[model samples]
Target: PTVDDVLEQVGEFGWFQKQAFLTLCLLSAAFAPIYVGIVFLGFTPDHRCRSPGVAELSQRCGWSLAEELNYTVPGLGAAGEAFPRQCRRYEVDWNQSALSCVDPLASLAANRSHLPLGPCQHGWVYDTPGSSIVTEFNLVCADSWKVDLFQSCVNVGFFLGSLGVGYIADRFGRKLCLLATTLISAVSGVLMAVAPDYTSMLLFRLLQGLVSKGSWMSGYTLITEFVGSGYRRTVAILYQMAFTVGLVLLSGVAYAIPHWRWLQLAVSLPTFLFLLYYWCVPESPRWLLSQKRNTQAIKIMDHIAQKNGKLPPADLKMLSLKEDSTEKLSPSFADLFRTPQLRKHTFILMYLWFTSSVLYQGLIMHMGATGGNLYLDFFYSALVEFPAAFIILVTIDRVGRIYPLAVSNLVAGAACLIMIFISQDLHWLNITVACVGRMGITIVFQMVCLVNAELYPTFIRNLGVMVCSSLCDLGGIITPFLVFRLMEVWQGLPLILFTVVGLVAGGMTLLLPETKGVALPETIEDAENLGR
Candidate 1:
């Protein structure tokens, strides 16, 4: 059917479509906060090097701010020695009164300045909460590994939940799946907010991740199924744009509520209100049709037409439901790799999903570690996402998906490579390059989601997406470790890794067929013949 045919039947600029779109928009907005919450929830504590000798000297002789700074600020020769390593503590026990903590300059006059400062044996002290995972879990000094477990636990939950809940959505109806996931997410998120200990908090965080992505995917599927084909792309893009808006909104909310748990509660509580949508949001008409419930599908269509102030066409009748004739040769996971053509597409798409998630998440989390004003930095990064979305909306039609998608990946990869070599002394330049990387990855991340559906056949379309996009979840699982652990080895290691992923994704995109102005594949044969 043509776009005109569907719109004429559904009514032009209808209220029903508008209402459904708005509901999906709100759902997208809610989803954004969860994806980016690590920036705010995982805070590092304030840290300082412990120096007992310095402590004793300060206590013995009152030192002004200027005097302390002069002696401690890293570059004044022997006096400033170990102070450059801010977190380390000096090993000496200077609490003894007989130690005679004389000033270095004064001791030099008396020929008694030969004492050593000694190595810091007490380790670094963290003082404040900004954006480090160390601060969020109070895991600084001796307990830093807890931060890794915290992030990994959530990803483990995501992996299991996506497989189980994804089946639930396909087995049950989309609306029911969405409502159930939403309620679970809301409760878990609130429980996480009030969790008393780190263990309990990890449990709730896992539960939240389990439900959040499934609910988001369900809402996305619902909107596409409810809308006419012509409006599908527009609705999908707008749905993601809503997420960008949510990121902007969340920056404000997080800034206002500096405490993590309160911020969690604030975002979680609103999700309960979404359960009210059960009364308003209709089940997918396409899903009803798929299940051979022609009567229900027609009823929904009639309702939509009435709500849109248009009458259902007199000749319109429910099409008889039939499985693809090739159902006997039903596509399986094996089918994805059975043929050279299918294998190439599967591998490329899978890598694209993984690359997009890793780079997108890695960059955002790394920004938290840059030792800058996180609130302002996060806000600035989020602001760029809107323009990225707008760029897709404006240029996808003109430039086509492949070229823009490839170019975005290339830009992101190039930015990461530049960032890795850029001197830390040029802080502004480093920040600027990182933001450019963020913007590029953001564009490619959104593009991967948009383009995946276009490349699969109807027979295996849903299955293909579910299977390949699971890699994105896998990427999520590894991202925290990649950034956090690699950072310890070399501060720029994560950026180098991102550079490889983005470049590989871009190169793979060049090998795939362009789907611009092409009809979606309907069967295995159509998929095989595509772009031939």
Candidate 2:
């Protein structure tokens, strides 16, 4: 008997699965703040050089805001200025008793052009009412790259941790890995909030990255294994929907808590609550059966049956998994490329994962350059993700995974292609097209997440998903360079590149086998025959 066979008799998705699903979805939601938390934590506001005596001088002179800016600030109205005037200061001292309030620079030198310029000797004064990491740590101008490094550190941790933890999950057990990763992730996440300095904060962030994503993937694999094949797609999509919920909740939370440390603390505290899953959630019965711990697996299955208000057949004691070929087969990373079909699936899935990250993050960063309010932009883009999931839910089962997956990529590429021709004069149209592109890419993200698990066998499923999805982290690492560097040559060059990349990804997606209505493959042979 397959685990699905027993699941069919017990309950495909009853109270037991529902409770587990909701609990796991919280894990997905908690991941959002970590993924996009940089937006709030690293926000850089308008600022200028904070001269030693400027505030006192301005107060004594009673200069208006505009007068102070026009007189003290260099290049205040210079057209097409790249760097802000915040990094430089006029070399004249403001504390001189001879200084005039009216045109201060004129009083100091023969010509304003003749005055020497120097780097900010004091520091920067920001214009925002709320503080961020940028404000607290002074990560502007020379130190601005620190913020990028901070973000990169986490992605680096994700790239390495996903691979290591994937193996741990497959070898040890999903429940064990989930519980361990959750406890570590919670500790590290909270520690990051209270870190004394940037170095310590980044270290804690890296630690959280190493375990948190793996924890999320473990939860995903566990939930998928717990349910019947018929309900797998729905739960997978809903699980991702929880991330979108996270994004919205993060925007609200960040808005409510303007201080970066407090915002970080607020998000991190909830993860500790996820540890209660140790008592509530169970190990994947399929994974237990794979390891030939049939008795323990059966006990868990009976517990599930009890929770779902069902009864096991009287002949259950004699039951054994149908794919029981456990002479001595163990999971290996090399197995992904050993067989032709698995190798082909691995390459394609990796590229698709990479492309999805590039386009999804690229589009958002592109829109961000247009200079909308940060919170509103994030909130609106997150709002579009809901409809993307809705469209997938309505169309996936009927239309199957491949077409929707392909079409969404195609739509995103088409949106990029169309954006090149649209005049910026029509701002509304540009935003509308951008939203359409976001929705399309969002669907692709969810589809890839669902399909990646379905294509792998139970033994290597967690490893396969992690290894393939690691490319997304790699893509995330490079997307800023791809978007920002390409934009220098032509404003639309990045979009054009995204258009080509997305179209190619969509084309290659068609080559993957359709997984709709197919049961989870139990072994290497079962996985090999998926296309056939």
Candidate 3:
């Protein structure tokens, strides 16, 4: 019997799927904390070079605080500047017996400009009541780039780990890979907190990257294979929606927690609980079915039917999976471009995914939200993302994935067009419209990921690179430029850019075939012939 036929009788999305769905969604939150680490980790608090002799010199002179700052630090208005001059130290030595208390500049016959300046010879005194990577490491002036190195290692780990582990999973089994990565991801995530030195922390972060992300993807892959193809839409949206859940919790948690390591610990600890999926979850019947391991595949479905309190199909057979070819045709990057239809699918999917990435990430980074306090305003704005998935959850099932996706893009493009005429003083209007754009872009990101995976047949990937270099996860390269530079040329340039990208993508969305309620294509011909 086909996997769908079994799913049809046993229940496509009964209680078992819901339980599994919740388990995966809740776990998705683990990936959020690592990126936002910059906010708390390197948060620059007010700081200035701590010249020991200056405090005593000022006190003995009985100088007021303002008088002391004016005399001691090189630059200031009557009120202090927002940032302290952490790097510069005045040339005068406080320990000198010859120094004058009455007028320290005259004591040395030197003035502010004349005082020879040097780097903070003594380590800095941080203003933070708590520590961060910046404060603890003294990652000031010259040394700050090392922070970049630390995060970069996390990425390198994920990059290599995903490729390496995925192959292992394919050869051995998904169950074993899922278990191993989850075990290490939880350990390494927590180990980052106890890491003794920077080197140790980097190693831990690297390991976490290699597995944590791979683990996250594996969890999703497991969910995908476990559930019915007919019911994938709700499950996929809900799974992605978990990412938004993690995002909202991150800002709220940061606001509540003072120490970053504690925050790291808090963020990471729960990922350990995902291990319950071991006893709770199982190998995907569809994957087993594809391997022609008919015996085990039936064993899994029967288990599902019994748990869901449903009847099993007694005569289930010939699961609608397309029969295999005698000669296996392997696919490559070249194969994606080799045939007319495959090339069309490849280029179109790339453009669609790239634009959506630009809209999804660019709108977020520098988005100037308005209204109340920064935290409250951000919290409210953050709430805007939740609805996009909710909207998709309700809408994609009815209209199908393609149309709702197109509508969201046009809504985004329309919002961008209107925003150009809209004034920034319309604080309620500006943030509201930006929120609307967020909803659209969020939907677009959902669609691009879903749509591309659908078009990218399994056999193509099994043979060669299905990635026309998709999700190396790289399209984020355009985002940095999309937000900062084009706006440098003109403030509204990004909206114009978003409007164009969104509209073009929306139009392209119309051209592409929808995958809703279909079995996965196994061969290039099946993929190439999709729209027909």
Candidate 4:
């Protein structure tokens, strides 16, 4: 059947189609929060070094909060002076009550006192709510390596969960897989929110990541299978658009609820309501047909036709399934790299997925570290993504997928390069460059999802996308370290990494066939001929 035939069967403005699309969009809204929760989780708390013998001195001298803050807080002295290390302690003895607590600035007049601070004999005194696990756990001071592990732990969950759940979806059914994952995600998210310690929080965060992506992928597949091909692009793009909305909403919610656990709970509680999807969302008719459940497929189609205010045509028997004799095999890890061309495509797409995810998430987390109002900065950067999506909708048809995709990568790369050199002294210039980077990567990020499907054949399309997109999980696992650790070395190191990744991804796009008006590939031969 032609596109026109499919469109005629599924009306352009059908109520049922609208309802289904909205439902899938809601699923996207839920997915977006989990992906960006790191910004709040990584927030550093206000802290002070517990000076050696200061506890006894405070008790004897009766030092109040103001006196302590003034004495201990960093940057309280002359300009350009090194901030006192949080872990450092004073050398003074507690019994020396008659000796005045000397001010370094005053002592500089006659060179009377030396900077006598030593390594902290006592631990840091963190300002509770402001002090995150990063500060309290001292992820910042000594063992920075642990921070990378903290972030990657979630991505590890995503990688394993997607593979395991993707198979379950194929074997069991999409609805069951979705429901099972959703329940797991909700419970895990709640647990993560209330987790008493960083170790338990990381465990639950990993669980959340594992199920969240699978649930999202299930929703995407279900909606795509239910819709007509003509409306697929629009529906898919809009579904993603909902995620942008969620990003915007998250900024506000996060600002209001400064605590990480509360924010996690707030975002996750809504997911529990999605369990009702079992009653509302129907099983995919396409999957039913694949399993030879013609009666159930017809029933679903009847529901669609009725909801669209049309009738199923007479003599509408299900067509015989096409049986390929080449092989009747299930997906395997080797399927991703069995052939030379397939191997090449898999490697390139994997890198592209990794690049897009790293750059996108890195830029976002970097905003929190840029030393300003995080809420406002996050909101401003997020606003740019909506325009990026609109630009894609307007241009992709006229310019084709490859050009826009390539150009977006180039823009993102250039923006990152420019951002690296933009002096911190010029605040506006830096912010502008950062926003441009955000816009560029956002465009490329969406394009990756769009282009991924066009590059694979029907038999391996789902498998190919799943395998390549798993790199996104890998990239996510690395992004926190890339930004946090790299920033410690040089604040702009992550941006430099982003530039390289984006440039490589853009250059590599030229190797793939332009998929503008081309039909989706139906077989392995079609995929091979497309030069994938």
Best by TM-score: 2
| lDDT (Cα atoms) of all candidates against the true structure | 0.70, 0.84, 0.68, 0.70
User: lDDT per residue, candidate 3, 1-532, as tens digits?
Assistant: 5566678788988888888778777777776665444555556665667887765675555677556556667664313452235567765677554356566666565545555767676777666577777777777766768887775666555546644555555444566777887788788878888877779878887777666655665666667666777777767777887877787887787778768689778877887777765777777675565556667777887888988999888866445355764342433345566668877876777677667766666566646744444446657766887887777788766778788878887887787777665675646677777778878887777776666655665534321222432343355544665577787898677777777887887898788788777876656677778888
Worst 10 residues of 4 by lDDT: 104-113
Give lDDT for model 2.
Answer: 0.84
Residues 413-456, candidate 2: write the lDDT tens digits. 88877876666555667888888988898889889989999889
TM-score of each: 0.78, 0.94, 0.82, 0.81
TM-score of 3: 0.82
Task: Count clashes in each candidate, considering only residues at least 3 apart in sequence or on different chains.
Answer: 18, 0, 5, 4
* Model 2 lDDT-worst window of ten: 75-84
Error of 1 at 296 (Å): 1.3
Model 2 steric clash pairs:
none
**Per-residue lDDT of model 4, residues 442-463, tens digit only:** 7887788777866765445556
In lDDT terms, which candidate is top?
Answer: 2
Ranking of predictions according to TM-score? 2, 3, 4, 1
Worst lDDT run of 10 residues, candidate 3, spans 461-470
